[PDB]
Amino acid sequence: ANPCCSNPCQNRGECMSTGFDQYKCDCTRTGFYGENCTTPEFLTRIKLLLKPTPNTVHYILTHFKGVWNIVNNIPFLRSLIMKYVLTSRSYLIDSPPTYNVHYGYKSWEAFSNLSYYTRALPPVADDCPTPMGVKGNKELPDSKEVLEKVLLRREFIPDPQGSNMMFAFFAQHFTHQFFKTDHKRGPGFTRGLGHGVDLNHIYGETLDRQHKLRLFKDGKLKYQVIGGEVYPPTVKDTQVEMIYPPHIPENLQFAVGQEVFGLVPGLMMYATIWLREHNRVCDILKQEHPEWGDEQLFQTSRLILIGETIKIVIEDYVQHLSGYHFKLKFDPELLFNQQFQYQNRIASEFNTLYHWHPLLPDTFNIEDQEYSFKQFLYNNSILLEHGLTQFVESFTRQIAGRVAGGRNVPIAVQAVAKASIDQSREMKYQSLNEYRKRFSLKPYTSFEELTGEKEMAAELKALYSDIDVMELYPALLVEKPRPDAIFGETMVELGAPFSLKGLMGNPICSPQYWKPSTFGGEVGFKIINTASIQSLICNNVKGCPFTSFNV
Amino acid sequence: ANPCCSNPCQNRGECMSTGFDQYKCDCTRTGFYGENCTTPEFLTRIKLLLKPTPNTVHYILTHFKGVWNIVNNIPFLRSLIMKYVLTSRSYLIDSPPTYNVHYGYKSWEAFSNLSYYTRALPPVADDCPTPMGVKGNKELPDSKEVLEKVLLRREFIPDPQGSNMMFAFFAQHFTHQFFKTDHKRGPGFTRGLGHGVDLNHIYGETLDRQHKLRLFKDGKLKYQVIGGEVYPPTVKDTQVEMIYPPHIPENLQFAVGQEVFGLVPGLMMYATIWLREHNRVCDILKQEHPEWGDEQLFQTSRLILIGETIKIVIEDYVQHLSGYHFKLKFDPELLFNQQFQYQNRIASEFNTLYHWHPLLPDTFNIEDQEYSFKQFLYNNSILLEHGLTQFVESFTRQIAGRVAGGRNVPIAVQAVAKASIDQSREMKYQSLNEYRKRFSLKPYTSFEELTGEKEMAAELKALYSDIDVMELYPALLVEKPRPDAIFGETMVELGAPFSLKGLMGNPICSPQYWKPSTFGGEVGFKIINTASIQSLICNNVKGCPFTSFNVQ
Numbered sequence A: 001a002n003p004c005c006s007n008p009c010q011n012r013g014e015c016m017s018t019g020f021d022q023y024k025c026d027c028t029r030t031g032f033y034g035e036n037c038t039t040p041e042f043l044t045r046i047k048l049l050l051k052p053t054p055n056t057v058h059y060i061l062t063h064f065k066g067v068w069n070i071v072n073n074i075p076f077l078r079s080l081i082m083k084y085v086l087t088s089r090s091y092l093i094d095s096p097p098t099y100n101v102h103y104g105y106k107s108w109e110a111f112s113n114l115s116y117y118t119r120a121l122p123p124v125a126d127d128c129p130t131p132m133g134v135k136g137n138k139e140l141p142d143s144k145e146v147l148e149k150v151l152l153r154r155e156f157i158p159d160p161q162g163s164n165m166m167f168a169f170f171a172q173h174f175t176h177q178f179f180k181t182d183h184k185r186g187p188g189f190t191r192g193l194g195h196g197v198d199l200n201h202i203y204g205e206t207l208d209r210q211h212k213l214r215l216f217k218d219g220k221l222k223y224q225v226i227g228g229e230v231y232p233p234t235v236k237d238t239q240v241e242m243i244y245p246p247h248i249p250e251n252l253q254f255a256v257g258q259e260v261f262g263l264v265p266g267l268m269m270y271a272t273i274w275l276r277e278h279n280r281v282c283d284i285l286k287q288e289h290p291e292w293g294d295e296q297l298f299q300t301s302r303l304i305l306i307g308e309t310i311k312i313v314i315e316d317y318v319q320h321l322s323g324y325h326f327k328l329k330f331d332p333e334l335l336f337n338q339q340f341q342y343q344n345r346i347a348s349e350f351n352t353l354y355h356w357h358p359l360l361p362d363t364f365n366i367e368d369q370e371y372s373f374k375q376f377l378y379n380n381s382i383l384l385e386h387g388l389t390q391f392v393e394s395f396t397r398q399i400a401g402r403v404a405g406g407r408n409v410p411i412a413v414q415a416v417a418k419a420s421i422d423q424s425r426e427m428k429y430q431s432l433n434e435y436r437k438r439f440s441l442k443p444y445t446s447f448e449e450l451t452g453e454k455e456m457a458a459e460l461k462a463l464y465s466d467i468d469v470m471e472l473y474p475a476l477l478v479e480k481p482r483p484d485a486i487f488g489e490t491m492v493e494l495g496a497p498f499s500l501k502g503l504m505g506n507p508i509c510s511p512q513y514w515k516p517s518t519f520g521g522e523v524g525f526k527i528i529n530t531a532s533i534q535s536l537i538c539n540n541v542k543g544c545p546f547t548s549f550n551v
Numbered sequence B: 001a002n003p004c005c006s007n008p009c010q011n012r013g014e015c016m017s018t019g020f021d022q023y024k025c026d027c028t029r030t031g032f033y034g035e036n037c038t039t040p041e042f043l044t045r046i047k048l049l050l051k052p053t054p055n056t057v058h059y060i061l062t063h064f065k066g067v068w069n070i071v072n073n074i075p076f077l078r079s080l081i082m083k084y085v086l087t088s089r090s091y092l093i094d095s096p097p098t099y100n101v102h103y104g105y106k107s108w109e110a111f112s113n114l115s116y117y118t119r120a121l122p123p124v125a126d127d128c129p130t131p132m133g134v135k136g137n138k139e140l141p142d143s144k145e146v147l148e149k150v151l152l153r154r155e156f157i158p159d160p161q162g163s164n165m166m167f168a169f170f171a172q173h174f175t176h177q178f179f180k181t182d183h184k185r186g187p188g189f190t191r192g193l194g195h196g197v198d199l200n201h202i203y204g205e206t207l208d209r210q211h212k213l214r215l216f217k218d219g220k221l222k223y224q225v226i227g228g229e230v231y232p233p234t235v236k237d238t239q240v241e242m243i244y245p246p247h248i249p250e251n252l253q254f255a256v257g258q259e260v261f262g263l264v265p266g267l268m269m270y271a272t273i274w275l276r277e278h279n280r281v282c283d284i285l286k287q288e289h290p291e292w293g294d295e296q297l298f299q300t301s302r303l304i305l306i307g308e309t310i311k312i313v314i315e316d317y318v319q320h321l322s323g324y325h326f327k328l329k330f331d332p333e334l335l336f337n338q339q340f341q342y343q344n345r346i347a348s349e350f351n352t353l354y355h356w357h358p359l360l361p362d363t364f365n366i367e368d369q370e371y372s373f374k375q376f377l378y379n380n381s382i383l384l385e386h387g388l389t390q391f392v393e394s395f396t397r398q399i400a401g402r403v404a405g406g407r408n409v410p411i412a413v414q415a416v417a418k419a420s421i422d423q424s425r426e427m428k429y430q431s432l433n434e435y436r437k438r439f440s441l442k443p444y445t446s447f448e449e450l451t452g453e454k455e456m457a458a459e460l461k462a463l464y465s466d467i468d469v470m471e472l473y474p475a476l477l478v479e480k481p482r483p484d485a486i487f488g489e490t491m492v493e494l495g496a497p498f499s500l501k502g503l504m505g506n507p508i509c510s511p512q513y514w515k516p517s518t519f520g521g522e523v524g525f526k527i528i529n530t531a532s533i534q535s536l537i538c539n540n541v542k543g544c545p546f547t548s549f550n551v552q
């Protein structure tokens, strides 16, 4: 019944029904005009001819290493390029946010209700004849058939980019502060009301949970010492709620900011490292300010760690992830003369694209042992047995799996990958090509163009029939990757806008926050600006072992 | 004992303790340097020479009417000036917000917790020797004495700008959507978690309250017809909570978005008008969109009424109180090429300054009846007896009181004015002169310079002793007003930045929202851009009576 089902409006245009069978496109500030916002303006047609494709831009950033080495050592040029990447990625994000799972139009409910994930593209209306609008069959192909034919792992495919298990667990740990689906409400709802890098996975979402995790002396968090080593406190000591199977004994029930971090020893590894980092910064600030009380020591330490997180994410995590020869920089001062909104809302599509379960290996290799999924999960004894030092050493060496390229999802995690497909359909996601068009990409003309391959493409041809009906999530995992890279085009071009906006949109990056006094003076400001994944491990892990995000 | 108690850092520099008896001033991006951020930069010194005083700017804006009449008719010049008044005012507001009642330093708790009012200036630390820091006596002057000497009304002092009761009640109605103090928690806490113009005073703060007020047909809100006239529904029929005394009959307990709006018929008048406006917009949108369901019709009408509100507040309400000959403009497009943050947090000081109880007359005059406070309060039968038409006609004629100039607070609300002094002390407010410096104003050197008069000044000097110890709230009500104006310098120079930032910081003013599609097309978009206080009354009140924010 809805005439906007076909998604007729192009180039960020907005559809609105003007009757039972009539529609109108709003072409305001698109650079286009006409019935479908397709006829380009004079300034736009010049920009389209001069605009290089993402593949060409990726090529320049991954080649000419000698030139980039000179570029990285000229401060004003490095700053200018990094300034451009922050602005050009961020304008792709709507801020303040617009749509959500229940609203395909703008409303005060969609803006004001923080329990929703926002949406990059509006949901397909309930009264549309097909799930994708008008194209394809009345039903999408069975999710289990899609899972088994093109997604599930036959043999382990390693990442050619060299990502290790330190990278995979950092990704899981970091993103689980802002990806916290409220399952009793639905897939499109979140428990992370801060919508970004607030470190609620260390400090808790609520004030009650935070206060239960705090020592209330010297700004520190509660901790226990087992075998001479500092670990998170217990559930018995703190009374915080954690997700644990009934057989886990009281002494192994570790209590951290996020309730699900006891599921994986890899997560509990980073939880321990960051807890140790917080108390370490408290010691530094206590030395600097003996006149400060517990409360200010805690709050200032939290702000420093937020700064540290964004610094590490940009200059180590995303740096390795992009695979660029250009040296990325975390510098809020770059946006001070630029139009930028210091706010963020976590998008549902950002959640979906970040389901990087192909990263997971067949077995988890620590020291001399190889642990299966059943042996590894919920089993924090492994952490106490080997220790943090051995965890860092082992996970730095162990190669993670390739995400794009197809057929690399572990069978032990098949239900989660099936859920990603089923819940995307529940939230009425638009097709892959619609999302590609939304982020300035050319739509795929065939399944062979998507995969860069013949076998999987033919299997997807029989299931979906049409390329304009292909779903976003399965396409991301099967997509043709860049030369010796972990991801394909769509992942980088959707992920970069969401990521950088969520990192720079933090209040600590705003002009009134980005100053030494915010972080307790020059000493706290220095902790942020000199932070790295290596120094995080060196200061908090015994022996100062070597680590990086690649093998 | 805290070294930052004296407030040593000047020009918006930040104080940080570097020991038990040592401090450090962070002069980052202030334009100043030195131990106290007092030594100006080269370009800062130049800017301070060319920068005119607020009094000089006010003069030019309130004089040369023949020149402004030409300026208003030149669209690019009108846009240029309005752009400047938006950007230069908003620059004074920290966004994202910083301090609150419990935090004199920046923290995540202060940023994230929406239950707090934000603070333009940090609170005086709990360990400071005096309430204002280091200056003054151990205790501030008796609040009863301050109230009775310089604040209380002897005889009614009318506003020289001509403000009427339509203005007074609009101010109360409008601001009470974001000024909603959570007295269960304390004076520094709010119930208005939207922190701006969301129209929760019509639609409810919570979703549960909204649905109890909604008809769920044609996007409309529930209503009743009493004597051929549309009024809000009852508490009995809807189960929405309202604050009423136990003696009020069921048929007189009207239920609206804001729980306190049964307090005065003046609030209920505007509640009824806006309720009628929402359902009127619902009929307009149904004509344009027969295919639309109830949910979309309701949500689109809300966004439209939010647009109408900001339009009326800028072009009619703020226009009148400013007293400028320059025609102000509501145009979000003015900020699309400017650095601006589309977010807002309500400041405690903005709440404090907006306590405009001197506006209230001794009696409320409707038709040929003069109602006392005792007769007026919690009495919705007055509204039913006279009707909305007579209410609008009467309130347009009745002069409101002068806010500044001292001694004009109605005795009936003396406890409210005393509470404002007490709660400001409770929230550990910095001095008047500290807030003046914060908003780029020269500090007063005497109480005579503050009042422009000799009697009240001497009364305040006997109480406070020092001008640097004078409190913000009482000073706003006793300040020397501008020529024939309602407010003094401090009220305007604090009020304008808070007000304009709140209005333009609304998401509907952002580029992705500010387009016809958001408001149901060109028809719904026109409703916003043509909205006025006259049109609001004309479309919703029988007989389209003349209305204005000033007396004729």
Ligand code: HEM
Pocket (backbone or CB within 6 Å): A168, A169, A171, A172, A175, A179, A180, A181, A264, A266, A351, A354, A355, A356, A357, A359, A360, A377, A413, A416, A419
């Ligand atoms: C260590 C082994 C892992 C296990 C056992 C695991 C398991 C799970 C499970 C059970 C869910 C809930 C699915 C649902 O909604 O029904 C989930 C969601 C998710 N997974 Fe994993 N996962 C693992 C590693 C990872 C890694 C390395 C990443 C990469 C970032 C990742 C990304 C995500 C994300 C972003 C979600 C959604 C979170 C939310 O919205 O609440 N996972 N995973």
Ligand code: HEM
Pocket (backbone or CB within 6 Å): B168, B169, B171, B172, B175, B179, B180, B181, B183, B263, B264, B266, B351, B354, B355, B356, B357, B359, B360, B377, B413, B416
């Ligand atoms: C119509 C007669 C009025 C009465 C009877 C009245 C009474 C009151 C009372 C009792 C309070 C304290 C609320 C409480 O603590 O329970 C209050 C607060 C306040 N008044 Fe009025 N007032 C009136 C008119 C006005 C007007 C015309 C304005 C101008 C805008 C105004 C501005 C305010 C503001 C901004 C607050 C603070 C609200 C809050 O923090 O929640 N009032 N008033």
Ligand SMILES: *[C@@H]1O[C@H](CO)[C@@H](O[C@@H]2O[C@H](CO)[C@@H](O[C@@H]3O[C@H](CO)[C@@H](O)[C@H](O)[C@H]3NC(C)=O)[C@H](O)[C@H]2NC(C)=O)[C@H](O)[C@H]1NC(C)=O
Pocket (backbone or CB within 6 Å): A113, A114, A115, A116, A184, A185, A186, B206, B207, B208
């Ligand atoms: C953000 O949006 C969410 C989705 O609308 C809201 O969550 C919903 O709140 C509703 C109202 O409280 C709940 O309705 C329930 O069912 C009926 C009305 O249909 C009522 O009689 C019940 O009292 C009410 N409560 C329950 C749980 O039975 C919804 O159940 C609830 N959940 C969902 C996913 O729809 C959020 O409230 C909203 N957040 C805010 C702050 O407004």
Ligand SMILES: *[C@@H]1O[C@H](CO)[C@@H](O[C@@H]2O[C@H](CO)[C@@H](O[C@@H]3O[C@H](CO)[C@@H](O)[C@H](O)[C@H]3NC(C)=O)[C@H](O)[C@H]2NC(C)=O)[C@H](O)[C@H]1NC(C)=O
Pocket (backbone or CB within 6 Å): A206, A207, A208, B113, B114, B115, B116, B184, B185, B186
């Ligand atoms: C925004 O800040 C508010 C002020 O700090 C918070 O409100 C306070 O939350 C506290 C609970 O986290 C309450 O204090 C008490 O804490 C003890 C812990 O030992 C509990 O047992 C009590 O149940 C609890 N309250 C009671 C009933 O005594 C405060 O009552 C409460 N209010 C004030 C004015 O302090 C908000 O929680 C915070 N908002 C968010 C979202 O974090």
Ligand SMILES: CCCCCCCCO[C@@H]1O[C@H](CO)[C@@H](O)[C@H](O)[C@H]1O
Pocket (backbone or CB within 6 Å): A051, A052, A053, A054, A057, A060, A061, A081, A084, A085, A088, A089, A439, A440
């Ligand atoms: C080598 C110099 C280029 C700087 C890197 C810019 C980062 C990528 O920039 C991206 O490029 C895409 C293709 O042009 C566009 O679709 C995106 O809008 C843009 O953000």
Ligand SMILES: CCCCCCCCO[C@@H]1O[C@H](CO)[C@@H](O)[C@H](O)[C@H]1O
Pocket (backbone or CB within 6 Å): B051, B052, B053, B054, B057, B081, B084, B085, B088, B089, B439, B440
């Ligand atoms: C010469 C400027 C006239 C244009 C009207 C601007 C509206 C008032 O602008 C205000 O002026 C004050 C005094 O100059 C400043 O302290 C404020 O920062 C500024 O916002």
Ligand SMILES: CCCCCCCCO[C@@H]1O[C@H](CO)[C@@H](O)[C@H](O)[C@H]1O
Pocket (backbone or CB within 6 Å): B148, B149, B152, B153, B154, B411, B414
């Ligand atoms: C109409 C007379 C106005 C002058 C009152 C100011 C002088 C202080 O007089 C006070 O007036 C209050 C209000 O009536 C009373 O509650 C106090 O008992 C009284 O002391």
Ligand SMILES: CSc1ccc2cc([C@H](C)C(=O)O)ccc2c1
Pocket (backbone or CB within 6 Å): A085, A089, A318, A321, A322, A328, A487, A491, A492, A493, A495, A496, A497, A499, A500
């Ligand atoms: C969330 S997945 C992802 C993949 C690739 C990314 C690349 C960049 C670089 C810096 C760019 O802007 O091109 C940034 C973030 C990215 C995130």
Ligand SMILES: CSc1ccc2cc([C@H](C)C(=O)O)ccc2c1
Pocket (backbone or CB within 6 Å): B085, B089, B318, B321, B322, B328, B487, B491, B492, B493, B495, B496, B497, B499, B500
């Ligand atoms: C809340 S009290 C108040 C007093 C005076 C105001 C003046 C202006 C004008 C348009 C300006 O910016 O000078 C705007 C808002 C104002 C608010």
Ligand SMILES: *[C@@H]1O[C@H](CO)[C@@H](O)[C@H](O)[C@H]1NC(C)=O
Pocket (backbone or CB within 6 Å): A374, A375, A376, A379, A381, A382, A385
């Ligand atoms: C938990 O870890 C221990 C030691 O690494 C191992 O022996 C045991 O098999 C694990 N438990 C489970 C349930 O597999």
Ligand SMILES: *[C@@H]1O[C@H](CO)[C@@H](O)[C@H](O)[C@H]1NC(C)=O
Pocket (backbone or CB within 6 Å): B374, B375, B376, B379, B381, B382, B383, B385
């Ligand atoms: C309420 O107003 C009516 C006029 O409609 C008046 O007769 C009555 O006395 C008032 N009630 C009170 C309590 O003063």
Ligand SMILES: *[C@H]1O[C@H](CO)[C@@H](O)[C@H](O)[C@H]1NC(C)=O
Pocket (backbone or CB within 6 Å): A006, A007, A008, A035, A036
């Ligand atoms: C928009 O494009 C053209 C108008 O140029 C028209 O033929 C077409 O039907 C419209 N809609 C769609 C679904 O392409």
Ligand SMILES: *[C@H]1O[C@H](CO)[C@@H](O)[C@H](O)[C@H]1NC(C)=O
Pocket (backbone or CB within 6 Å): B006, B007, B008, B009, B034, B035, B036
């Ligand atoms: C700050 O100003 C000077 C330093 O130039 C210093 O002597 C003085 O003591 C300070 N003033 C205050 C407010 O203490």
